């Protein structure tokens, strides 16, 4: 499975090194630069619970998902994960609940202590 591969081959990109955000590069991006805090980032993504449930994709609404990086506009995994990406990169992220919705979850969609899996493509990033 796409999740287990991240469990097995993924790099722990967390600061505390608690394996709470694991990353695999599936497609290498351009050049060397990676986004700054406050950069307006554009992505397409596909995501779901680790168990395959609650699938969501930006593609099926024909629009890039946009947010400001490192400002807490998204789950912690996304701020940590997207900051490591190069433009045009595609990566897979496995995100423990501590770096997503925690014990509370977000009902009715996200249950308590859900692990989330994402495929993220970094389309672009520009300055604050
Ligand atoms: C830690 O801080 C948090 C900050 C925000 C949220 C709200 C959810 C946030 O979405 C997410 O963080 C992730 C990553 C981005 C894609 C959507 N996300 C999801 O979990 C979605 C799915 C959950 C099921 C698995 C597949 C993804 C959820 C919204 O249905 C989300 C959803 C929709 C929009 C959004 O922000 C748009 C960016 N800006 C926000 C201010 O207005 C300008 C746009 C952000 C939760 C947080 O933690 C519990």
PDB file of C-alpha atoms and ligand atoms in Angstrom:
ATOM      1  CA  UNK A   1       0.000   0.000   0.000  1.00  0.00           C
ATOM      2  CA  UNK A   2       0.959   3.640  -0.548  1.00  0.00           C
ATOM      3  CA  UNK A   3       0.789   4.271   3.257  1.00  0.00           C
ATOM      4  CA  UNK A   4       2.948   1.295   4.335  1.00  0.00           C
ATOM      5  CA  UNK A   5       5.635   2.255   1.798  1.00  0.00           C
ATOM      6  CA  UNK A   6       5.964   5.585   3.642  1.00  0.00           C
ATOM      7  CA  UNK A   7       6.076   3.686   6.934  1.00  0.00           C
ATOM      8  CA  UNK A   8       8.893   1.503   5.528  1.00  0.00           C
ATOM      9  CA  UNK A   9      10.878   3.901   3.294  1.00  0.00           C
ATOM     10  CA  UNK A  10       9.860   7.365   4.486  1.00  0.00           C
ATOM     11  CA  UNK A  11      12.222   9.919   6.001  1.00  0.00           C
ATOM     12  CA  UNK A  12      11.309  11.334   9.433  1.00  0.00           C
ATOM     13  CA  UNK A  13      11.195  15.082   8.742  1.00  0.00           C
ATOM     14  CA  UNK A  14       9.993  16.038  12.246  1.00  0.00           C
ATOM     15  CA  UNK A  15      12.140  18.120  14.547  1.00  0.00           C
ATOM     16  CA  UNK A  16      11.479  15.870  17.565  1.00  0.00           C
ATOM     17  CA  UNK A  17      12.197  12.748  15.459  1.00  0.00           C
ATOM     18  CA  UNK A  18       9.079  10.924  16.704  1.00  0.00           C
ATOM     19  CA  UNK A  19       8.182   9.610  13.194  1.00  0.00           C
ATOM     20  CA  UNK A  20       5.045  11.795  13.283  1.00  0.00           C
ATOM     21  CA  UNK A  21       5.543  13.030   9.714  1.00  0.00           C
ATOM     22  CA  UNK A  22       7.128  10.637   7.201  1.00  0.00           C
ATOM     23  CA  UNK A  23       8.001  11.625   3.650  1.00  0.00           C
ATOM     24  CA  UNK A  24       8.842   9.948   0.368  1.00  0.00           C
ATOM     25  CA  UNK A  25       9.744  11.892  -2.769  1.00  0.00           C
ATOM     26  CA  UNK A  26       7.843  10.280  -5.676  1.00  0.00           C
ATOM     27  CA  UNK A  27       8.826  12.909  -8.251  1.00  0.00           C
ATOM     28  CA  UNK A  28      11.886  15.138  -7.979  1.00  0.00           C
ATOM     29  CA  UNK A  29      11.187  18.871  -8.404  1.00  0.00           C
ATOM     30  CA  UNK A  30      13.121  21.737 -10.003  1.00  0.00           C
ATOM     31  CA  UNK A  31      16.335  23.390  -8.880  1.00  0.00           C
ATOM     32  CA  UNK A  32      17.142  23.597  -5.177  1.00  0.00           C
ATOM     33  CA  UNK A  33      14.901  26.188  -3.523  1.00  0.00           C
ATOM     34  CA  UNK A  34      12.168  25.323  -1.075  1.00  0.00           C
ATOM     35  CA  UNK A  35       9.479  27.599   0.312  1.00  0.00           C
ATOM     36  CA  UNK A  36       9.867  30.226   3.067  1.00  0.00           C
ATOM     37  CA  UNK A  37       7.447  30.913   5.930  1.00  0.00           C
ATOM     38  CA  UNK A  38       4.674  33.225   4.672  1.00  0.00           C
ATOM     39  CA  UNK A  39       5.104  32.069   1.062  1.00  0.00           C
ATOM     40  CA  UNK A  40       1.800  31.691  -0.729  1.00  0.00           C
ATOM     41  CA  UNK A  41       1.975  28.060  -1.893  1.00  0.00           C
ATOM     42  CA  UNK A  42      -0.107  26.352  -4.633  1.00  0.00           C
ATOM     43  CA  UNK A  43      -0.620  22.570  -4.506  1.00  0.00           C
ATOM     44  CA  UNK A  44      -2.714  19.738  -5.811  1.00  0.00           C
ATOM     45  CA  UNK A  45      -3.206  16.882  -3.425  1.00  0.00           C
ATOM     46  CA  UNK A  46      -4.943  13.604  -2.855  1.00  0.00           C
ATOM     47  CA  UNK A  47      -5.492  12.501   0.719  1.00  0.00           C
ATOM     48  CA  UNK A  48      -7.360  10.065   2.918  1.00  0.00           C
ATOM     49  CA  UNK A  49      -7.243   8.293   6.273  1.00  0.00           C
ATOM     50  CA  UNK A  50      -4.538   5.626   6.477  1.00  0.00           C
ATOM     51  CA  UNK A  51      -7.310   2.981   6.272  1.00  0.00           C
ATOM     52  CA  UNK A  52      -8.435   4.273   2.826  1.00  0.00           C
ATOM     53  CA  UNK A  53     -11.517   6.129   4.038  1.00  0.00           C
ATOM     54  CA  UNK A  54     -12.653   9.784   3.507  1.00  0.00           C
ATOM     55  CA  UNK A  55     -10.821  10.367   0.221  1.00  0.00           C
ATOM     56  CA  UNK A  56     -10.348  14.005  -0.788  1.00  0.00           C
ATOM     57  CA  UNK A  57      -8.695  15.527  -3.864  1.00  0.00           C
ATOM     58  CA  UNK A  58      -8.144  19.092  -5.088  1.00  0.00           C
ATOM     59  CA  UNK A  59      -8.295  17.884  -8.703  1.00  0.00           C
ATOM     60  CA  UNK A  60     -11.997  16.991  -8.660  1.00  0.00           C
ATOM     61  CA  UNK A  61     -12.775  20.656  -7.865  1.00  0.00           C
ATOM     62  CA  UNK A  62     -10.476  21.838 -10.703  1.00  0.00           C
ATOM     63  CA  UNK A  63      -8.497  24.328  -8.602  1.00  0.00           C
ATOM     64  CA  UNK A  64      -5.097  24.413  -6.862  1.00  0.00           C
ATOM     65  CA  UNK A  65      -5.305  24.440  -3.061  1.00  0.00           C
ATOM     66  CA  UNK A  66      -3.626  27.673  -1.846  1.00  0.00           C
ATOM     67  CA  UNK A  67      -2.321  28.647   1.603  1.00  0.00           C
ATOM     68  CA  UNK A  68       0.342  30.667   3.435  1.00  0.00           C
ATOM     69  CA  UNK A  69       3.189  28.476   4.605  1.00  0.00           C
ATOM     70  CA  UNK A  70       4.206  28.100   8.244  1.00  0.00           C
ATOM     71  CA  UNK A  71       1.311  30.163   9.655  1.00  0.00           C
ATOM     72  CA  UNK A  72      -0.872  27.365  11.097  1.00  0.00           C
ATOM     73  CA  UNK A  73      -3.448  27.638   8.267  1.00  0.00           C
ATOM     74  CA  UNK A  74      -3.240  23.851   7.815  1.00  0.00           C
ATOM     75  CA  UNK A  75      -2.443  20.755   9.889  1.00  0.00           C
ATOM     76  CA  UNK A  76       1.053  20.696  11.381  1.00  0.00           C
ATOM     77  CA  UNK A  77       2.232  17.956   8.957  1.00  0.00           C
ATOM     78  CA  UNK A  78       1.501  20.208   5.984  1.00  0.00           C
ATOM     79  CA  UNK A  79       3.507  23.154   7.323  1.00  0.00           C
ATOM     80  CA  UNK A  80       6.389  20.809   8.134  1.00  0.00           C
ATOM     81  CA  UNK A  81       6.069  18.749   4.953  1.00  0.00           C
ATOM     82  CA  UNK A  82       5.506  21.409   2.254  1.00  0.00           C
ATOM     83  CA  UNK A  83       8.442  23.527   3.503  1.00  0.00           C
ATOM     84  CA  UNK A  84      10.740  20.628   2.452  1.00  0.00           C
ATOM     85  CA  UNK A  85       9.440  20.439  -1.118  1.00  0.00           C
ATOM     86  CA  UNK A  86      10.898  21.829  -4.327  1.00  0.00           C
ATOM     87  CA  UNK A  87       8.691  23.295  -7.063  1.00  0.00           C
ATOM     88  CA  UNK A  88       7.274  20.521  -9.261  1.00  0.00           C
ATOM     89  CA  UNK A  89       8.072  17.933  -6.582  1.00  0.00           C
ATOM     90  CA  UNK A  90       5.516  15.276  -5.715  1.00  0.00           C
ATOM     91  CA  UNK A  91       5.818  13.596  -2.314  1.00  0.00           C
ATOM     92  CA  UNK A  92       3.818  11.263  -0.091  1.00  0.00           C
ATOM     93  CA  UNK A  93       3.281  12.160   3.592  1.00  0.00           C
ATOM     94  CA  UNK A  94       2.117   9.913   6.390  1.00  0.00           C
ATOM     95  CA  UNK A  95       0.951  12.098   9.279  1.00  0.00           C
ATOM     96  CA  UNK A  96       0.357  10.785  12.791  1.00  0.00           C
ATOM     97  CA  UNK A  97      -2.656  12.304  14.675  1.00  0.00           C
ATOM     98  CA  UNK A  98      -0.299  14.468  16.763  1.00  0.00           C
ATOM     99  CA  UNK A  99       0.531  16.345  13.513  1.00  0.00           C
ATOM    100  CA  UNK A 100      -3.051  16.319  12.194  1.00  0.00           C
ATOM    101  CA  UNK A 101      -6.323  16.327  14.223  1.00  0.00           C
ATOM    102  CA  UNK A 102      -5.075  14.690  17.455  1.00  0.00           C
ATOM    103  CA  UNK A 103      -7.424  12.984  19.921  1.00  0.00           C
ATOM    104  CA  UNK A 104     -10.272  15.405  19.227  1.00  0.00           C
ATOM    105  CA  UNK A 105     -10.484  14.480  15.553  1.00  0.00           C
ATOM    106  CA  UNK A 106     -12.887  16.599  13.523  1.00  0.00           C
ATOM    107  CA  UNK A 107     -16.285  14.958  13.567  1.00  0.00           C
ATOM    108  CA  UNK A 108     -18.168  13.693  11.739  1.00  0.00           C
ATOM    109  CA  UNK A 109     -15.332  13.355   9.106  1.00  0.00           C
ATOM    110  CA  UNK A 110     -12.083  12.726  11.029  1.00  0.00           C
ATOM    111  CA  UNK A 111     -12.222  10.329  13.990  1.00  0.00           C
ATOM    112  CA  UNK A 112     -10.022  10.461  17.085  1.00  0.00           C
ATOM    113  CA  UNK A 113      -6.360   9.533  16.571  1.00  0.00           C
ATOM    114  CA  UNK A 114      -6.522   9.268  12.792  1.00  0.00           C
ATOM    115  CA  UNK A 115      -3.335   8.873  10.756  1.00  0.00           C
ATOM    116  CA  UNK A 116      -3.604  10.778   7.447  1.00  0.00           C
ATOM    117  CA  UNK A 117      -1.954   9.959   4.126  1.00  0.00           C
ATOM    118  CA  UNK A 118      -1.364  12.622   1.461  1.00  0.00           C
ATOM    119  CA  UNK A 119       0.113  12.809  -1.998  1.00  0.00           C
ATOM    120  CA  UNK A 120       1.141  16.473  -2.527  1.00  0.00           C
ATOM    121  CA  UNK A 121       2.372  18.179  -5.700  1.00  0.00           C
ATOM    122  CA  UNK A 122       4.019  21.572  -5.213  1.00  0.00           C
ATOM    123  CA  UNK A 123       3.021  23.668  -8.214  1.00  0.00           C
ATOM    124  CA  UNK A 124       4.389  27.022  -7.117  1.00  0.00           C
ATOM    125  CA  UNK A 125       5.364  29.332  -4.297  1.00  0.00           C
ATOM    126  CA  UNK A 126       5.747  33.115  -4.171  1.00  0.00           C
ATOM    127  CA  UNK A 127       6.699  35.550  -1.412  1.00  0.00           C
ATOM    128  CA  UNK A 128       4.571  37.158   1.296  1.00  0.00           C
TER     129      UNK A 128
HETATM  130  C1  LIG B   1      -3.260  22.809  13.015  1.00  0.00           C
HETATM  131  O1  LIG B   1      -4.092  23.811  12.406  1.00  0.00           O
HETATM  132  C2  LIG B   1      -5.158  23.529  11.585  1.00  0.00           C
HETATM  133  C3  LIG B   1      -5.510  24.467  10.620  1.00  0.00           C
HETATM  134  C4  LIG B   1      -6.586  24.245   9.781  1.00  0.00           C
HETATM  135  C5  LIG B   1      -7.331  23.072   9.869  1.00  0.00           C
HETATM  136  C6  LIG B   1      -8.439  22.939   8.983  1.00  0.00           C
HETATM  137  C7  LIG B   1      -8.258  21.921   7.887  1.00  0.00           C
HETATM  138  C8  LIG B   1      -7.392  22.447   6.751  1.00  0.00           C
HETATM  139  O2  LIG B   1      -7.018  21.315   5.935  1.00  0.00           O
HETATM  140  C9  LIG B   1      -5.918  20.594   6.323  1.00  0.00           C
HETATM  141  O3  LIG B   1      -5.224  20.880   7.305  1.00  0.00           O
HETATM  142  C10 LIG B   1      -5.615  19.466   5.509  1.00  0.00           C
HETATM  143  C11 LIG B   1      -4.446  19.755   4.573  1.00  0.00           C
HETATM  144  C12 LIG B   1      -4.897  20.655   3.438  1.00  0.00           C
HETATM  145  C13 LIG B   1      -5.911  19.954   2.560  1.00  0.00           C
HETATM  146  C14 LIG B   1      -7.104  19.706   3.405  1.00  0.00           C
HETATM  147  N1  LIG B   1      -6.826  19.034   4.734  1.00  0.00           N
HETATM  148  C15 LIG B   1      -7.637  18.103   5.336  1.00  0.00           C
HETATM  149  O4  LIG B   1      -7.373  17.623   6.447  1.00  0.00           O
HETATM  150  C16 LIG B   1      -8.930  17.632   4.599  1.00  0.00           C
HETATM  151  C17 LIG B   1      -8.985  16.080   4.404  1.00  0.00           C
HETATM  152  C18 LIG B   1      -9.143  15.263   5.735  1.00  0.00           C
HETATM  153  C19 LIG B   1      -9.430  13.845   5.236  1.00  0.00           C
HETATM  154  C20 LIG B   1      -8.135  13.309   4.658  1.00  0.00           C
HETATM  155  C21 LIG B   1      -7.781  14.082   3.398  1.00  0.00           C
HETATM  156  C22 LIG B   1      -7.732  15.591   3.664  1.00  0.00           C
HETATM  157  C23 LIG B   1     -10.184  18.134   5.359  1.00  0.00           C
HETATM  158  C24 LIG B   1     -10.306  19.652   5.266  1.00  0.00           C
HETATM  159  O5  LIG B   1     -11.368  17.572   4.784  1.00  0.00           O
HETATM  160  C25 LIG B   1      -8.011  23.326   5.842  1.00  0.00           C
HETATM  161  C26 LIG B   1      -9.154  22.999   5.116  1.00  0.00           C
HETATM  162  C27 LIG B   1      -9.702  23.898   4.198  1.00  0.00           C
HETATM  163  C28 LIG B   1      -9.088  25.133   3.974  1.00  0.00           C
HETATM  164  C29 LIG B   1      -7.925  25.440   4.676  1.00  0.00           C
HETATM  165  O6  LIG B   1      -7.254  26.615   4.562  1.00  0.00           O
HETATM  166  C30 LIG B   1      -7.246  27.263   3.317  1.00  0.00           C
HETATM  167  C31 LIG B   1      -6.028  28.175   3.370  1.00  0.00           C
HETATM  168  N2  LIG B   1      -6.352  29.569   3.791  1.00  0.00           N
HETATM  169  C32 LIG B   1      -7.084  29.666   5.070  1.00  0.00           C
HETATM  170  C33 LIG B   1      -7.469  31.112   5.382  1.00  0.00           C
HETATM  171  O7  LIG B   1      -8.152  31.687   4.233  1.00  0.00           O
HETATM  172  C34 LIG B   1      -7.263  31.804   3.147  1.00  0.00           C
HETATM  173  C35 LIG B   1      -7.010  30.351   2.723  1.00  0.00           C
HETATM  174  C36 LIG B   1      -7.402  24.542   5.587  1.00  0.00           C
HETATM  175  C37 LIG B   1      -6.995  22.126  10.859  1.00  0.00           C
HETATM  176  C38 LIG B   1      -5.909  22.353  11.721  1.00  0.00           C
HETATM  177  O8  LIG B   1      -5.494  21.485  12.689  1.00  0.00           O
HETATM  178  C39 LIG B   1      -6.497  20.709  13.367  1.00  0.00           C
END
